[PDB]
């Protein structure tokens, strides 16, 4: 019981916002989101640019 | 003793007083009827008859009709040298472009 309690309910009461937790939370929390936003936004902007110029092969692409 | 509170009751084993229990009720007669309605209306009616009903739905969402209609049009258009399909969905003579 102590083990399951320590791994859940007891965590937030003993949490303190400080340099370590703030940086890790920002790095692990927001970091991946910003990274994946710029991967997909970049890829889709490139692909969109090619389609408008007829330079992307979509010969048999009728399912989406 | 702190407040007057009942001690926690011990967990009852339905099988102890009724080795033939179905787990529905402590009364053996009610227990059997609860089993029968669940199994009859559950499996005999809803699942079996419902499965049959779904299997024989009359052309769900027009898919068979559309195939027959497509065959009719393909036969007609190829028999008249027309394209099987046209890029324009709507006749251009009904459209007035800007400028």
């Amino acid at each position: 019981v102590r083990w399951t309690y320590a791994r859940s309910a007891n965590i937030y009461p003993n949490f303190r916002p400080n340099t370590k937790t703030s940086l890790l939370g920002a790095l692990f929390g927001i970091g991946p989101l910003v990274f994946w936003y710029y991967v997909f936004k970049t890829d889709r902007d490139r692909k969109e640019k090619l389609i408008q110029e007829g330079k992307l092969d979509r010969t048999f692409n009728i399912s989406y | 003793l702190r407040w007057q509170e009942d001690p926690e009751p011990e967990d009852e084993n339905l099988y102890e007083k009724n080795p033939d229990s179905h787990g529905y009720d402590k009364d053996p007669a009610v227990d059997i009827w609860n089993m029968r309605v669940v199994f009859f209306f559950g499996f005999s009616i809803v699942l079996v008859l419902g499965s049959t009903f779904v299997a024989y739905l009359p052309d769900y969402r027009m898919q068979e009709w559309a195939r027959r209609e497509a065959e009719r049009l393909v036969k007609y258009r190829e028999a008249h040298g027309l394209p099987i399909m046209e890029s324009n969905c709507f006749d251009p003579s009904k459209i007035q472009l800007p400028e």
Binding site: - | W65, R67, M85, F90
Partner: protein, 173 residues
């Protein structure tokens, strides 16, 4: 059954047997066993069933839809006219999906039928598949899950404008 023009197939050319071996052909003797033991009793049961169906002959009909005015002739926000045009456009859209499916089925039947010579002998089916897919893509591609006749019309006019602009600057040259 099915119409042979819609689902064509070339005439069948079967080479005649021409053995050069005294050994009996096991398939020939298995084929006769199959006819006697399998195809024959199965044919008798079917004939019994088809006699029962002939006693009770009833019919079903392919539904015909009258043509109604389409979205181009509907006045804005006029739901009663838009409704009938939109339902017609959806019926046509489902029909066009089946036309592409028919053309795809021809293409796949050709590739299997022609074996190792399919790359040459299916050129016609490939050409027809290419043309229909282009036409279908022009009508319906990129409309989105909330597609409608209105969005289809907007897409056509954008394409017609581009084709009209590419011409005045292709006739100026």
């Amino acid at each position: 059954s099915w119409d042979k023009d819609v689902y064509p197939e070339p005439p069948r050319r079967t080479p005649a047997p021409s053995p050069q071996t005294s050994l009996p052909n096991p398939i020939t003797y298995l084929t006769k066993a199959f006819d006697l033991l399998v195809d024959r009793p199965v044919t008798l049961v079917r004939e019994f069933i088809e006699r029962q169906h002939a006693k009770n002959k009833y019919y079903y009909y392919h539904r015909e839809f009258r043509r109604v005015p389409d979205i181009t002739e509907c006045q804005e926000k006029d739901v009663l006219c838009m409704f009938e045009a939109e339902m017609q456009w959806r019926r046509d859209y489902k029909v066009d999906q089946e036309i592409v499916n028919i053309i795809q089925e021809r293409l796949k039947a050709c590739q299997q039928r022609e074996g190792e010579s399919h790359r040459q002998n299916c050129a016609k089916e490939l050409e027809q598949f290419t043309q229909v897919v282009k036409a279908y893509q022009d009508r319906y591609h990129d409309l989105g899950a909330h597609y409608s006749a209105r969005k289809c019309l907007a897409k056509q006019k954008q394409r017609m404008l581009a084709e009209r602009k590419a011409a005045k600057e292709a006739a100026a040259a």
